[PDB]
Symmetry: C4
Amino acid sequence: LRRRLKYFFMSPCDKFRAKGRKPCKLMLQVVKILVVTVQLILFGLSNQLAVTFREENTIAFRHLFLLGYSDGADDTFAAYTREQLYQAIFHAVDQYLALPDVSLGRYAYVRGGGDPWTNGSGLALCQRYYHRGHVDPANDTFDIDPMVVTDCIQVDPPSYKNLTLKFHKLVNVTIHFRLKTINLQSLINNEIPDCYTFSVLITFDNKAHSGRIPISLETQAHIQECKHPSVFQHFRLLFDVVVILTCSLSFLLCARSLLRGFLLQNEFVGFMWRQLWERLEFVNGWYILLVTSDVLTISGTIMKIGIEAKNLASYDVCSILLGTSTLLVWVGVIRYLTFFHNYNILIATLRVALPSVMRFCCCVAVIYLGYCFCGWIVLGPYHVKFRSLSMVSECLFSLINGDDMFVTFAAMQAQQGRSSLVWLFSQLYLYSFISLFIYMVLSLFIALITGAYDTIK
Amino acid sequence: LRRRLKYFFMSPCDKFRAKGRKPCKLMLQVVKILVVTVQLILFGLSNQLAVTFREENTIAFRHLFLLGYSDGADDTFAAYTREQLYQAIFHAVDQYLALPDVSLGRYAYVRGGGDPWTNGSGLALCQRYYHRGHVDPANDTFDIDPMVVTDCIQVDPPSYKNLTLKFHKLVNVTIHFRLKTINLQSLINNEIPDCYTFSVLITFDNKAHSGRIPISLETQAHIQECKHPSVFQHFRLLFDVVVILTCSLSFLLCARSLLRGFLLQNEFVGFMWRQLWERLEFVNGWYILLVTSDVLTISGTIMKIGIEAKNLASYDVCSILLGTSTLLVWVGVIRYLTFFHNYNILIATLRVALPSVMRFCCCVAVIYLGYCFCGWIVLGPYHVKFRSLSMVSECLFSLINGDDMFVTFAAMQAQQGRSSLVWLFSQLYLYSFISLFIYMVLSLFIALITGAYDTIK
Amino acid sequence: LRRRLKYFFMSPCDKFRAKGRKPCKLMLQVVKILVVTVQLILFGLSNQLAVTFREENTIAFRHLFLLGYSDGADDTFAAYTREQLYQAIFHAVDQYLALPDVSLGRYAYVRGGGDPWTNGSGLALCQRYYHRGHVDPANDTFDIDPMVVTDCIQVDPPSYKNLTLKFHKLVNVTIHFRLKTINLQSLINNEIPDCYTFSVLITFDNKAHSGRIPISLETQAHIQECKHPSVFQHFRLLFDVVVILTCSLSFLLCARSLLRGFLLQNEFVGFMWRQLWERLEFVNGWYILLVTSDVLTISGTIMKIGIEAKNLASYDVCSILLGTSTLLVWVGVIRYLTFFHNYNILIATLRVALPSVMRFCCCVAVIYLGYCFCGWIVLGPYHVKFRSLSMVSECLFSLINGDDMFVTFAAMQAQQGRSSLVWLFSQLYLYSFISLFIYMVLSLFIALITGAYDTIK
Amino acid sequence: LRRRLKYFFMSPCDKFRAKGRKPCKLMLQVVKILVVTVQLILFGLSNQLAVTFREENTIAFRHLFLLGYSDGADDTFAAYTREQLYQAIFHAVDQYLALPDVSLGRYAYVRGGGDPWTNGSGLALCQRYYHRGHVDPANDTFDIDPMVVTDCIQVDPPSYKNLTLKFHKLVNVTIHFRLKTINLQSLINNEIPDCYTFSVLITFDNKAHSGRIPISLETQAHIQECKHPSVFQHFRLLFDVVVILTCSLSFLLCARSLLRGFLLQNEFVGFMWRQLWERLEFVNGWYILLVTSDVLTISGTIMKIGIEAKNLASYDVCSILLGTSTLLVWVGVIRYLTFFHNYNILIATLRVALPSVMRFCCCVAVIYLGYCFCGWIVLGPYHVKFRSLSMVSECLFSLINGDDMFVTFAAMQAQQGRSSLVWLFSQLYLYSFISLFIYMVLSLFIALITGAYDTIK
Ligand SMILES: CCCCCCCC(=O)OC[C@H](COP(=O)(O)O[C@@H]1[C@H](O)[C@H](OP(=O)(O)O)[C@@H](O)[C@H](OP(=O)(O)O)[C@H]1O)OC(=O)CCCCCCC
Ligand SMILES: CN(C)S(=O)(=O)c1ccc(S(=O)(=O)N2C[C@](C)(C3CCN(c4ccc(Cl)cc4F)CC3)c3ccccc32)cc1
Ligand SMILES: CN(C)S(=O)(=O)c1ccc(S(=O)(=O)N2C[C@](C)(C3CCN(c4ccc(Cl)cc4F)CC3)c3ccccc32)cc1
Ligand SMILES: CN(C)S(=O)(=O)c1ccc(S(=O)(=O)N2C[C@](C)(C3CCN(c4ccc(Cl)cc4F)CC3)c3ccccc32)cc1
Ligand SMILES: CCCCCCCCCCCCCCCC
Ligand SMILES: CCCCCCCC
Ligand SMILES: CCCCCCCC
Ligand SMILES: CCCCCCCC
Ligand SMILES: CCCCCCCC
Ligand SMILES: CCCCC
């Protein structure tokens, strides 16, 4: 029994010496690294083609439909006079009607199909305003029924010029239309082009009632298989099957090893009773990682095959699955470096250090969250880097690492004249956070890890 | 007596075991964290609405009244010819007169009400120049009486075109006017809109007499309750009361604990005399922090209620109070981690290290201040990052942390041709500061903290 | 024998004391540092002249031939309407035909000389499109033969206006032409000007078929000697010969030393057998470095002479050879600091630490590569810093060093609305990578080096 | 003798206890810190006024005389066609002639006064070209006499339109003129305005002969006292005298202390002989620093008085003297913290560590310089951050500190297509430099300092 456990815990070379066992699993891991990385790279081509088609079409739409638009102006693009707003709206509608004659792309119109379009209508131009909107700042008076009324004008693809905006109670103006196009660039990857429908929404937003109306354009892309396409004189499937077989064999071997470990546990524990933390010692966490990676790889490969067959179109989910599986496959080879101490410094140190690090983070996290909430709410209206909670966390994390510090300070220098109290608070907030976290918290965080290393050294 | 002191210093779990005491204060702290964070987030909505209204109106005013203005040009926007300046002034006045017909916002005019406006006047266009201003660079001569004379033209809302600027002795030109508007976006937060008055000042500044006249626009916003408003078919107050009650109960419990500690002190010291630094051992600093946080939270909640009732308008002060109270409430929960050593590394290390750190900072601060003053005065005229003392401190602090270094060096590369001696001095200054502070000062600063940790380790 | 080995391992001062040997090699190294650095600086003048000529001519071509081009617009310069594309093409051809009258440079035309130009033709205007290109997005249909057909129009330097683009199946449009000019600025370096031929390619790229056609201009420069030039009344060669002689003498002395060491080895090993890692102890690695540097310097000097004689034009290869040789020559002087322990801390520490560092990197590299591949494929379509594998490695390496962190986070904030799953994955990816590598991997990497120093301390 | 030496080395408090000595020098140092800092701040006002006048006038000149100039375009502003160049030249001359009618500043013309102006001429328009310039790229031929001929046209302030540029052999075109103005803003500081003469040089540079001619404007400012000015109804001098007296008293006390120390040395050494590194122990380096600071302060104060009296105009030298003296005065107070060990950690550590640090830097410097030269010459033509040696040193120093790393990598990504070999070399260069210096050199540099601290700890 003692000899059996010893052999169970021996290294692949020692196991080969003791029983001549061929290290099949190691060769499988090397082959898996190769094939999974290749498959990820090959999938990247189709992924990139889809993403590029979407983004480039959207940029072209911005240049076609937004009057006076230039690259890099998305965040500030806005209208400031009634004349500017009317011109922008009419320019968008006119360009929609002129598209077949001016555009470099080839687009088809879409009519009807439910709200906001009536049957036969390609473009919907809608204004939304308050039901009752009497506003009299001269008398410091107003009478509002804030229920929103929508008024929509329908334009058929080849009377909207009579649009009259109710500026004083206007909530917003929207233009909705759909365009069909074909992603021909797929031919360069030896793939059949897909049929895209772009749903285009142009928003003139007046919700702030501030005299400035921002203008934006957004698109939603829907992918379909085209109807009986034809490519003249048009292997991924075999490689996908090879990946699936390699991952399945690895999964079966890992499951066999895990079952063997479970049986050896049961045996040893039963013997020890007749003569939980110690039970989780026959469990090889590396093999749990390997089976997880195999499951992820197989799921991603199935999804990739489905997308290639045009049954699915979820490029992002497939890419995440395959990328995570590739990372885990690369990481999993470290198991075979754990037997040699000279190569196991990182994992040994991590195993020793993680408990104390988690206990330390328990106390650090409340301070971090307090700072996050305070910054988000107090400074967010004034500081571009504090607009949302996740943005605040990114800014604070970068500050801890010494990044983007002066610009963070400088963003507040504009408020020194306007809001002096806010500026002073921001000084105290930033200086105290940086000092406490860089010089005290991070110091001890690193000291715990280096002390663990000194222990395992 | 010894048993009583021991119990006084026992942990909540130990106190429960010894007397069955229910840990009411801990549950109160958890509830306070939840409710105070929620209240801060809820206040953030109104705060953001107010700040956004102000900023967006100001941006719209810049686009409406400044001829040829574009976003991002505020720091360099200026006139360079007499024709440009006249056109800018007349454009601003004409736009003020045309506002009801062109603006996307709804504004009302304000007349009279003291200087600089006469009764019935909406806009004041004033030029300020020297009383006597004979300037003759051809003969290297001048005769100046630098007393400032103001000449103001009054424009009523719907002869200023005859303005004649005295360019050679002109000090500046200002345009003052006020506009009234209503912040309707508040309806989205189920709040009654407020009435805003924007005081708008446009400055054409010639104080440098350098041939370049910068142009700027600034606004001051004053908030009022509107006169008998009406919102059709229009709980925060209950939640505020809940926060106040929770904080009041916590305050009373903390005051009771502090009184008990004071009595136990008095007893022990009296006994020790019959048989200051040691006296400050029954004082629970965590409870001082808790009572401070409770006072801040109650004050901020009262201010928030007042603002909601429209008796107050100090959003910034309220936001600072509530944000600081939220941070302190989050921090104060660390008290309950202090009993367990494995979770108390940060606080134990800080308690051991702070005295030596303060002694070290005593010596470091004089060097830091010397560098601050030298940089501010010598380099400030030439370097964008050294314009003011606070900006100099921000730049030096960021340099110590390794941030924004190359751009700091590169800002001076332009002067290498013009002012070579200044460039050389800047090289010496920056290199010496960075070397001394990053490699010597900060090293020992961190070494003190890690040595304290080694002590408490 | 023992005395002979001792002397072999003695320092230059000790060898001088023992035998009066004059330290010729040390003086040679000092002289080499001086002369090699001077030669590199002198070569830099010609290198800079060539590079500047190429880049400035290319910038001028962009301003001359690209309609509406401005500096800094290269990455976004594009056409969006048929009218814009036609205007850009015709503007380029018209400017080519007008060049002798408008350009500030002096250019000569090149005719014929093979494809894509026919004999006598200076400019080739070619459009490439699919052989059969029926595209019908209205019916979700298409019939494509993706074989590319090229149609070229030839323009002689002083009917292209009849160009009809097949927009629906257009692959791209290219304009090719060559221009000859003379790099006169070489006169300032007392050199004979060379004759440059610039091959200019303007691309209007429609491979994405996205409605946006990017426009780019590229140049290839070919340098020739001009035919019987004449500079009125027009030493580098002697200095090059001096460098060659110094390096040759150093090489011969180092080869002599290496032979002596090899003989001493052979002797000692033969004696030890009658009475491999120990064999690599008579090998002076510093002298291997010195001979490598001498070979590189001689090769670079020969190349430099050839370029000066106008037999060669490979400035980049010569610059790399001479720069690397200069770096190695500067480094090689450290050999003489190795005898004194107080000056040998760096090399002693490196010698002790390198093996453990390499073993540690063995395990770190698989994790790094996994992250590289995952980021490149999953995030590359969405993140400007993840476009290519080398770019991904640069971004991750910079993140490990705490650089450019917040902007890396912020590039993904745009996708939070569009692609929420990708944004969440990017959050997990970046946070996990930064935490693991900055706080755990780099910590132990530094700890190995400092422990080696503690050993040799 | 032993008692006398002991007293000589006692602290100020101990000396007061032993002899009742009043610590006059300490109070003098505090007073000096106050007064010197105040004087520096007060001088900053005049310094800022002068610098601002110069810079603002130059910006106005750029906007007035450069056709189509915009802020931020200085580095790329250039002409590309003959028509553009002619228009720019004629616009500059026309604006010079129209200045009295259009400019917002008040300027007087300057005539004659030597080259390049003839008597009575205000503006010189000069073109420089080769004496003989036959250039024939069609035949790959040229005949050049590179002697430069200058042809100058003189314009009197209120035939230059007949200018004919020799484009094929043109070296450059320059416009020279001088303008007089008065710095009136000095009145705000209660100072008499000075008379400025701006010498303005506009350069159209064709030295590259590349088809792109950069255009630049530069100014030289000369300050004079105006002739019998007059300011109606117009103390720094007393404060300057106070600073001088304080510094003189401090200097005398320090000289007395140094003489006493020298006498005590002489005595002790003579006694030790009858019964050099040890000799430099009675020398108080703090007092050498104090006397140096006093000399600098007195020199700067005298210069400041001279500038106020308008005998001098060297603002930069005065500012450097006063700023350095302020920094040294702040630093010198640390002497009184050296007696208490708890406050002397920094100085004790520095004294222990400096010798080993210097020995380490001896070896590091050759590697650093090798990298500097290699980068400057190989990468400088391709990389904006490697243009000059000082720029290269700034970039490498910033990289060592982890700053601006990704942008340094990204600047080379453009050359990956064009110059692949240079891109590969840049990869090797940057990666090797960063790894070696951040992880190995800086590690040991910090380790030496922390080990010294451990010694004095
Ligand atoms: C009785 C259980 C059910 C039947 C099991 C039958 C055998 C089976 O399944 O695998 C055997 C090996 C396993 O290969 P592999 O898993 O690498 O081999 C095992 C591991 O080396 C394990 O150590 P760790 O890796 O550290 O856990 C060790 O303890 C086992 O010793 P032991 O055998 O004495 O218990 C080995 O058998 O793999 C093949 O021989 C490939 C077969 C396919 C080749 C062609 C593919 C196209
Ligand atoms: C090591 N130094 C930096 S430190 O200064 O010592 C230190 C130590 C610990 C803590 S922490 O415990 O507060 N915490 C905070 C944080 C930065 C989080 C990690 C989760 N993120 C997250 C993002 C998106 C989503 Cl959707 C959900 C999330 F949860 C948000 C950031 C982090 C990273 C790694 C280890 C601990 C911690 C702070 C500072
Ligand atoms: C730890 N390293 C950085 S260090 O290099 O070791 C080191 C150590 C100590 C000192 S310091 O004692 O001079 N001092 C300087 C400073 C950066 C101040 C803090 C107050 N700020 C402030 C801002 C606005 C207002 Cl209205 C008022 C103010 F007062 C201005 C900056 C700081 C922060 C934390 C601890 C000490 C110090 C320098 C470097
Ligand atoms: C020390 N820290 C940063 S660390 O976090 O501890 C750590 C330690 C080791 C590794 S690593 O072993 O993966 N590796 C990764 C890398 C950053 C490479 C070096 C080669 N480059 C390369 C570039 C172009 C070409 Cl054409 C070919 C190439 F090969 C790409 C980057 C590196 C540099 C130095 C030592 C080791 C390593 C990672 C992190
Ligand atoms: C040994 C550790 C891993 C080092 C490899 C990291 C990636 C290196 C960059 C990729 C090579 C250049 C390919 C061209 C990219 C366009
Ligand atoms: C991923 C590691 C799981 C096992 C813990 C470490 C022991 C080899
Ligand atoms: C905020 C902490 C106050 C008490 C000092 C630390 C002892 C638990
Ligand atoms: C470049 C160093 C080669 C020799 C190894 C170090 C021993 C002096
Ligand atoms: C500037 C310090 C000079 C004296 C050396 C340190 C001993 C107090
Ligand atoms: C094994 C599950 C596959 C889902 C795509």
